[PDB]
Structure formats: C-alpha cells, structure tokens
Symmetry: C4
Subunit: 196 residues, 4 copies
C-alpha cells in the first residue's frame, strides 16, 4: 500500500515540487448518478506549489425569480449544498477533487429533467476560499457554470495515477469528461417512480 | 443568456471598475410576504471597487426583557435567523443584495402584528463581516433598525438592470421601497388562520 | 426610544471613547432559573477602546473521568453549550454581556443538584476569541471557574444604565451578584417532577 | 482542588515555559470501547511554547472506491466525524489531547471488524489548523494513519500528572499505548447483537 500523506505531513503528489499560480475549475459541470442519487459535479484544481489552509468550497445558484406574490427578483442567489452540513465542503486540496452536490428535495435542480435543462436560465457560481500557506493571505477563486455548460449524463475522467512511489496528475484530462448511461428523468421524477 | 460571473472569475458588474469606500445598509427594513411566508428584509450594499471574501451577515435583536422569574435584562440580545443554517448568510456580494429573515415560530417577530409593531420597543442590529480582498484586513460594518424604521407591507425596489453586456446598479433606488398588499395579521395569526 | 447603535454603525456606549487593555470575565458564575430553565451564567466584558470582530464565545468542562470500561481520563474536556447551534455564541460585544448555558439533558450539569455541586471536582474554562479591530490581530482571552466559584441560586447585577443620550456601564457592579429564590433540585430532578 | 487554568487565563502546565517547534500526532491510532461505543482515537500534541487560537481538528478518509454505477474514484475523500456537530472539534490545546471519533452508522468504519481491518486499503489523514498566538500566522499540521498503523483493541497511555502545583506531561508516554479487552465484532455487528 502506497501512502498519500507521509508521517511528517508531507504529501506524495507532484514529484519534486516546492510546498502567482491560479487555481482552476473544470470548464464544465456534469450531472450523473452516484450510488442511486443524481448528482451535479464540477472539479476544483489544486495549487501546484503550495497548500491552501482553512480551505472551503461553496456554490451559489443565480436565477431570476418571481415570488407567488408577484415580486420579481432578478438574479436571485441561493446556496447549493456541497457538503456544508457534514464538513465535506472543508477540503483537503492536494490534487484536483471532484465536488458533488446531491440533487435532492432541497436542491434547486430537484425538478429539472434532461430535456428541461437547456430551457432553464440559470448560473452556478463556484467559489473557493482558503488561506495560501506560503503567502499568508486569504485567497478567493471564482468561476461560473451557465446552463449550456452543464453536461447531462457525463462523468469526469480520472486524473490521478500512481507513478514511482509518487502520485501524478494528468492535467490534460482535467477538463476531460466521458458520457455514461444516465436516466433523463428529473430527480423528482426518478424518486416518484422508485417510490412504487 | 448574459453571464453574471465570467469563466476566469471576473464578475460583469459596474462597467470599468478596479476589482476608503464604506459599505451601505438600506435605511429601512421592510416586512412582507415571500411565497406564503411573512418576511423581514433589509438590503446590504456592495463595495464598488473590491470584493469582500469570507463575507457573512448576522443580525441581533436588542430588546430589554423580563424573565418569568422577574429578572429584567436591559437591551437583551438574541440572534435573528438570516440564513445561518443553510449557509445563506455566506454572501456572494457583487451587487446590493436583499437579505431576508423568515418570520417563523422561532423568530422574535412571530407574534408581532402590524398594529402591534409601532408599540414595540426593539432594535435590529445588522452586522456585515468579511475580509477586504485588496486591503487584506478583516472589516466589519454595522447599522441599526429601530421600530419606526421597519416598514410593514413594503418591498425593496429592484436596483439591478442589464446594460450593454454589463450589469449596472441604479444606486438611487437603493434605499427605495414601494408598498404592496400585505396582510396585517401577525405571522402566528396568519399561521393559526391558515391552519383551518 | 434611545438607540443603542446609530445609523452609521457607531454605538452609543462609553461617552467619548476612541473606537493594551485586557478583556474581563466575572470572577464568579451563577446558576439560576430563566423562563423555567435552570441556567449557568458568567459575564464577559467588552474592550473599552475597540471592537472585537468575528467575536465568539465557547466553554470547556475540564473533568477527570472514568469510562464504563475502566479507562480513566484525567481532566477530560467536553463542550458546554453556549449558543453554538443558533449562532448566539457569535457575540456583539459592545457592553458586558451575560452568557448563558441552559442546563438540559445534554449539559454536563444535568444531574447536579445544589447540595451535590460542592462535592464535584470540575472546572469550566471560558474562552473568548475575536479579531481586535484596531490591532488587526486575532486575540484570545481565557479564564476559569472551579466548583467553589459557581454560586447556586444567584443572578448578575445589571451594569447597563441610560445617561444623557449615551449608555453607561457601572463597572463596579460588573462582578456583582445578588441572591434569588431558586430551587435546589437538579435540572433532571426539576424535569422529572414537572413531568407529573 | 488544583486548577488547570488560572483566573488571569494563564494555564498551569509545563512549569516555567514562555507562553520553530512542530506539533505532533501519535504514530498510531487505536480502536476500543468508550462507554459502550466503539471508537477510533489518535492523539494530538500541544505546542510547548505557545497557544494555538481558533484551533480545530478534522480528519479525512482517503479510500479508492467504486460507485454502484461502476464509476471508480481513486483515493476518494470523506469526512470522519471528530466533534464537528457539537463544537468538540474546537480544541483547547494546552496538553496532548486524545481525539475520538465514535464509530456509528454514519462512520466509514461501521462495518469493519477486527479481522477485516488488515484487509482494508485505507488512510486516515489528520489535520490540525489554528493560528499560532505568538507568530500571528495561521498554521496547519498534517499526519497520516494507514491500515497497519491503526491498532485494534488498544488505549492511549495517560501522559498527564500533577507535580508541585503544576501539571506535567510525560512526553515519553505520548505515543505509548496498551492493550485492553475489546470485542472483535464490527460496530454494526456489536449493534445488531446488542439489539436482541
Ligand atoms: Gd478566520
Ligand atoms: Gd485522455
Ligand atoms: Gd426610481
Ligand atoms: Gd452596587
Ligand atoms: Gd511508560
């Protein structure tokens, strides 16, 4: 068994690194099943030459909306769940990670089907915040997913592989995704059906 | 569909900005319905020339009170819910936002009607805390709503409008509110009645 | 109605202040009823000449203990609830505040009566943490309550009074407490009895 | 009764200290019962010559996994519960502490027996984060537990002892553990059996 993090705390990634380089978000988000739950996923990249401490991910849905009392909220924001309640939004960023929001009754995608997706006018903002170990200062990195950039029925290609006692990242496959067999029913629709 | 935040993370607000200017709270709070829930709302302004990171909103009710055992607490504080449990108090401040506290069984306004409001002796303190991206240092901004400054049955005028691929803020309408048809029963009273 | 915090965010306490002075904890803790709940309370002082931002209170019970499998833990620590779940541990420190932990089924005092208190070998550590507005740096202040310093059946004297449009703190009464009629049954005992 | 923390806030540990020295994690983790619950425990060391403020512990399970839809996640991360929900991950680090994760239905060890443990291919990453009082800057310390370093049926030797009004740490016993009678059934298996 080859360790990921060594006893002294030094990780075993990017052979020979030094732990202004920018953090990266995959250009596309994917929707697909993970153990019977439909999921939205995007990938967040590491910083090749330093750790990010007290590092956390959060996501906002920007969507103009009308309240049942006729109040129109242009570009209304609402939180997307990405591990807040279990501390799974508290990231150990030492190689690109796939973040995952389970599309459940409380998720803003609960009733969005495959066909219905392209019709929607919405934007997912992805926001990484941490303190850069080296610099000492608190960072923030942002990016955005519009409808047309969320791919229904795909999965992220794996970028991690074990080479020579070290773990190495194929950063060419970072943004890379493949298709997978995935129902086109909305999570609600899937749940309704499973419930009989 | 015009993006709000671009792929690189730069937002599309305040054409040609630079991302000591003060943050702003609307001078008035409003109470009115949002999808069947009575709500207290105040508006919190952005910082025209920098982001605020790890930015969060919280609110305190200052109200002198007597305990059933005759203990009098002058200016007692208690937390007003403004998205703490869902991370919706964790703000993405890139244009003035309306903050909203749903007046429910756990809210200090649960039993306050319209008529009963002006009678009350209370103060809502609004407290924004974040780290200013540029400066590096942690900010705090405060303001206050006394009874006479909470307007029953109003809504905030919209300040956001899409001009020339950019989003622009009509800051003249910032503090601006209009009236809307809103029941004058207390949330409790509304709930009691709906529950038959 | 005289405001506590003004529109611009400046508070109306300590007429003519400047917003290394030390933060203070009352020398004694008290136990007594607040609306039918038995409560432990200690008082935490403000900083006469600056705000504390992102300010929070937490408390630890230090108590040596034996596990049912005969494992002895000298000075075991366990968290005392002082508003963590509702954000009421997130303090707006602009004048001495009484902190309050409701002694419930989950509290380490649940079964401790008045008579039984002096018998106990325990210590409450009180820990204030915030960033000092002026200095820029994160502070921590600590203090400690041993058995003999928790007073059963007392309440904290009020220190707040309204003088000349300003609110003024009688710091002589800070540590001051008076007695009040308070049952000597343990919270459990009180609950058992009330439950018939 | 000898105090642990004095009225002024100065602790009574490491007689005559000064409050780049490294923080320490015990080289081994142990699994054993604590009041009827099976538990994983590792020990986290203090910093002999300074406090760590806003100090917190978190743990990640690194484990390559396959989703029921055949998606393979190399080195998947998932949060181990170590007091997040009760604020018990918010540490008062003034002498080595034993951290403890109760192996319950939500824990990744729920179904892992004693025999089954050595078969498993998994790694627990332990991550301490706090601000170093003196330095002013935010620290992070890491270490790692692979299968072969988690000891089933052991307990950590005590390192705390009261010498001359001061508390002293036998740092030789830090990594020291002894065996204890401990069932070899998995937590699930223990729970199933207890439930009849
Ligand atoms: Gd912080
Ligand atoms: Gd490829
Ligand atoms: Gd207007
Ligand atoms: Gd007095
Ligand atoms: Gd020994």
């Amino acid at each position: 068994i080859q360790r990921y993090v060594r006893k002294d705390g030094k990780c075993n990634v990017h052979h020979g690194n030094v732990r202004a380089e920018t953090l990266v978000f995959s250009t596309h988000a994917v929707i697909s099943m993970r153990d019977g739950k439909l999921c939205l996923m995007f990938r967040v990249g590491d910083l090749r030459n330093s750790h990010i401490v007290e590092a956390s991910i959060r996501a906002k849905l920007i969507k103009s909306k009308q309240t049942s009392e006729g109040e129109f909220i242009p570009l209304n924001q609402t939180d997307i769940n990405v591990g807040y309640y279990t501390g799974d939004d508290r990231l150990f960023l030492v190689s690109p990670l796939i973040i995952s929001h389970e599309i459940n009754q409380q998720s803003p995608f609960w009733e969005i089907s495959k066909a219905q997706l392209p019709k929607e006018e919405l934007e997912i903002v992805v926001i990484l915040e941490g303190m850069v170990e080296a610099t000492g200062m608190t960072c923030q990195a942002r990016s955005s997913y519009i409808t047309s950039e969320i791919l229904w029925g795909y999965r992220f290609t794996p970028v991690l592989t074990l080479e020579d006692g070290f773990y190495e990242v194929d950063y060419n496959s970072f943004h890379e995704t493949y298709e997978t067999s995935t129902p086109s029913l909305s999570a609600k629709e899937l749940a309704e059906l499973a419930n009989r």
